[PDB]
Design a protein around this ligand. Structure first.
Ligand SMILES: C/C=C/C=C/C(=O)N[C@@H](CC(=O)N[C@H](C(=O)[C@@H]1C(=O)NC(=O)[C@H]1C)C(C)C)c1ccccc1
Ligand SMILES: C/C=C/C=C/C(=O)N[C@@H](CC(=O)N[C@H](C(=O)[C@@H]1C(=O)NC(=O)[C@H]1C)C(C)C)c1ccccc1
Ligand SMILES: [Zn+2]
Ligand SMILES: [Zn+2]
Lengths: 301, 250, 301, 250
């Protein structure tokens, strides 16, 4: 990693009498100082780490007896978008999310967690089922945008996403969505129209990639660090704007360092947010979501 | 007083071109129609009311040179922002309308566009009026970042409430309709209409290339299931007229 | 045609003094005697005539200002299944049907009125819209089954049809369906779950083609005439069983002889059946359809 | 006391094969499971009640040698018709069920099958019970012609009423599921399950060839979106158990 260059130079000299003790103590504090005080672009590379925990990593630690359900009753089962039904402290729930892949070969299988339009329709189907049986819906956002190109658009990628947006808007069941990887604009919002939205402290949420922003606005792609800082894509940035409802703590170094530690934190959030929404009935919870997204944005009358 | 046709390069006398609804006489190419023109081209004379005529943008993310880039387009266009909204009538039948104008910041959707589209959608909902939207856009306005994204949600929410009241929403996709806009309200009409040779897609080649290192035409989208009708502009008025009449609350 | 062999032999000799007057008078009565007393297999060839009136033939004579609507918001616009919105004596209605094609080249275009799964989804979309805006739904059945094969099944032909069946069942708007060509089993029932079902006197309705029945049950395909007679596929046969609600008269020789004459008859049926269902509200008309199909079939307790 | 595996031709001692739920030990091929076996394989001991145990077919179209063809299968199978229906329990949770048996007239759907499936679906509706159907069929029964077709409608009607009550319908497609059956209730489960190598399609080659002169496998259908799960029979009980528990009316 880029910002681990100083940490690399410290432990390079220790692996060559009294220096060793002081350097190793010095490593302890500096490693903390760095990971405790993170710059926005440091957070973007942490979220892009191949080893960052995927949805299927988190589920077993959070939900009891999770059963994957496949397909869109239409065209295909999208590897990149998984879903199913399980339990959360006794109560049946539906779970949905983008699946990033763990190793190289597995990334190829999952199309890096970029959903085709069949993925969004599969997500929709499952949420309609949840609404039907009154199950809460948890979604996991982890995508660098929806799968682009002719083939994708040729099967209604625009429409797959837009339909989700309008159906999610009026879901008469609680929806809680959480960003664990990147939050690729519309691909992310396609399963992100939630009553409460949560983010991992080192995850991303944005209309475009900083590299995209750089090639369009800065007219030079090799300027993504600055674009990212300008774009305000960090968990904290988004929290200040009132777009998300909370930021979850992350283990030192990144969520990938300790999956179980991280997964327990997601459950405590899931549980606590879900308890907000118990007062709300089937009509009232739809209205709650309406009132969240209706009131986002700033203008001058 | 002259506008050149980009397709066939033949020069024309704007007066008559406007009376042909900006359709090229020679090659039939459909030139862009400004918001107030579009509105005139479909509404009964003197029946238009404009909602939120003077709502300007602001700068939440403090994006550099954003507010001045807005002036450049206000001064050049005459519009306060890239969407004109209000109510009108067509052959005696009232309807709310939101025409997007792609000269003003490529018709990109920021907070103002979301709020104005919601305010009209929400008006129609109260008064049970069909609502008609003309999309023309390059996607989300990157200068307001995540807020521009959330406009996709903000709009959808008003639209679905409007739909749940049993009210007609016609999506009229004009050249060009792309990105967040096509991935939001532009795709979800009860009836989806477009125009010959209009360019409709999702992610652009510049975005898709950096984000992860004629199929966009309206006629192609109709073959591939996504449009109810490709409407020549000579049949626009009549087409919209009949649609509203069928959906007239008896 | 097969049963016009006697009529052919009569007019062969007239086109060669007192014979001519008597033969031409004799032709008059025999031509009537034949077409007034039709055998089941005579009716099957009449329905298979390339020139038999299609849906788009009938619509202009029945409905005012018909506007075709295209697509399934999914994959394609199926030439074989057309639909739209128009007027019927003042009232807005939705209209749907299979489109057979008129000439050879046009049959190729329309895939002979055999719908792909995109066709049934396009039909469904339009009816849901009708239900939303409270428009009555008229459907035109004219298909020799839904388009078969890998490609079709590979995109959910079974599911496209089954979904229509369950959605049509609970439509809170009146549905009136009519057979004008053949009624190819499931392809026909896929847009035939109606409150009232009507048939042209020389149309067909059946689980299989008689040629199909012959190759399976008689183990010899060249025996379809007998299969047809056994299968009871005529309009009258179906009327006796209580599966359809009325049979429309047809001009002498076939509906193709006079399209306007025939189309006026379809309107008077459409209008009269629709007037039955005025007493029924949005909940009650769904129940009416339930009670039709719930009570079809015979068994021994 | 011996049943030969059609796939790998190895001969087996039926006693143990039944205890393995008719799964071939050697090659894992899933042999057909008779209605009463299937029911036993998924229900708590002594919890099964059978509905309409003695409903026979009749002959509306007076089809030749039809009633005697029914006897041949009654005598050979022991069943009165090709679907067994009733209520049972699984790990304490009640549910209605309809298992189709493809030995009796290839499991073709006539009037009796429609009426029995409706009577159970309609029972579950009253008593708010999930309902589970095991399809095994060659399509509509051609001997009752148009009536067999209308069974697709008759069933769908009860099923949608059952769905509108917020009640779970699990569609368990067993080998083989085809024709009217796959084009009706078999495709429309809230959850659709099948079994390894089961053959699922619509129109057969003999029908499609005369009607107008391994892609049908369950694993293929799951790739192409139409199945929630391909369930090995070793996980059947557990799978169905959990599904009902999730859908347990709290
Ligand atoms: C000054 C730079 C202007 C860039 C505008 C641009 O390239 N728009 C693209 C369309 C596009 O990719 N729009 C993006 C957009 O709205 C999409 C969105 O909602 N989610 C995405 O991931 C984006 C593709 C914008 C945020 C850039 C385009 C390409 C070709 C013709 C018309 C439009
Ligand atoms: C004795 C003759 C038995 C013929 C049974 C048969 O061929 N069924 C076919 C499936 C089939 O085409 N079923 C038909 C059927 O139900 C379909 C229906 O609902 N609408 C159709 O157009 C038929 C294809 C039956 C009416 C024949 C088959 C083929 C291969 C494997 C399994 C089933
Ligand atoms: Zn030109
Ligand atoms: Zn074997």
């Amino acid at each position: 990693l880029d910002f681990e260059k100083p940490l690399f130079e410290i432990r390079n000299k220790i692996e060559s009498q009294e220096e060793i003790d002081m350097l190793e103590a010095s490593l302890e504090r500096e490693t903390k100082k760095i990971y405790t005080n993170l710059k926005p672009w440091d957070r973007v590379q942490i979220a892009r780490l191949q080893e960052r925990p995927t949805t299927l990593d988190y589920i077993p630690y959070i939900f009891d007896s999770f059963m994957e359900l496949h397909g869109d009753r239409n065209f295909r089962d999208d590897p990149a978008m998984i879903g199913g039904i399980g339990f959360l402290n006794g109560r049946a729930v539906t779970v949905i999310g983008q699946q990033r892949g763990k190793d190289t070969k597995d990334n190829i299988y999952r199309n890096f967690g970029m959903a085709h339009p069949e993925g969004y329709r599969k997500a929709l189907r499952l949420m309609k089922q949840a609404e039907k049986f009154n199950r809460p819906i948890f979604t996991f956002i982890d995508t660098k945008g929806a799968y682009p190109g002719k083939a994708a658009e040729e099967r209604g990628q625009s429409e797959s996403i837009a339909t989700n947006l309008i159906e999610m808007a009026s879901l008469k069941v609680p929806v809680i969505a959480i960003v664990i990887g990147e939050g690729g604009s519309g691909g992310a919002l396609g399963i992100g129209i939630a009553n409460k939205v949560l983010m991992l402290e080192n995850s991303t949420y944005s209309v475009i990639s900083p590299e995209g922003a750089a090639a369009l606005l800065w007219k030079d792609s090799n300027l993504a660090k600055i674009a990212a800082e300008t774009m305000k894509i960090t968990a904290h940035d988004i929290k200040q704007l009132g777009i998300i409802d909370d930021v979850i703590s992350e283990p030192l170094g990144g969520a990938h360092k300790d999956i179980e530690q991280q997964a327990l934190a997601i459950k405590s959030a899931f549980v606590a947010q879900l308890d907000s929404l118990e007062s709300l009935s089937r009509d009232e919870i739809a209205n709650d979501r309406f009132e969240k997204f209706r009131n986002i944005g700033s203008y001058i009358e | 007083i002259m506008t050149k046709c980009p397709k066939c390069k033949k020069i024309m006398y704007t007066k008559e071109l406007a009376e042909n609804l900006n359709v090229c006489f020679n090659c039939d190419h459909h030139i862009a129609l400004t918001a107030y023109k579009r509105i005139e081209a479909i509404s009964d004379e003197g029946s238009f009311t404009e909602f939120d005529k003077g709502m300007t943008s602001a700068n939440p993310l403090d994006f550099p040179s954003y507010l001045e880039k807005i002036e450049k387009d206000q001064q050049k266009t005459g519009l306060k922002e890239a969407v004109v909204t209000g109510t009108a009538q067509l052959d005696g039948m009232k309807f709310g309308v939101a025409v997007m104008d792609s000269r003003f910041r490529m018709g990109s959707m920021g907070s103002v566009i979301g709020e104005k589209i919601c305010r009209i959608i929400d008006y129609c909902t109260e008064n049970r009026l069909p609502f008609i939207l003309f999309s023309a856009s390059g996607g989300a306005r990157m200068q307001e970042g995540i807020i521009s994204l959330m406009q996709m949600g903000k709009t959808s929410v008003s639209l679905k409430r409007h739909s749940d009241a049993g009210l007609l929403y016609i999506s009229y996709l004009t050249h060009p309709t792309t990105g967040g806009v096509s991935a939001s309200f532009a795709s979800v009409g009860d009836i989806n209409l477009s125009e010959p040779k209009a360019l409709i897609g999702f992610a652009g080649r510049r975005v898709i290339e950096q984000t992860i290192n004629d199929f966009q035409t309206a006629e192609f989208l109709l073959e591939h299931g996504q449009l109810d009708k490709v409407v020549h502009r000579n049949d626009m008025r009549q087409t919209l007229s009949e649609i509203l009449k069928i959906h007239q609350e008896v």
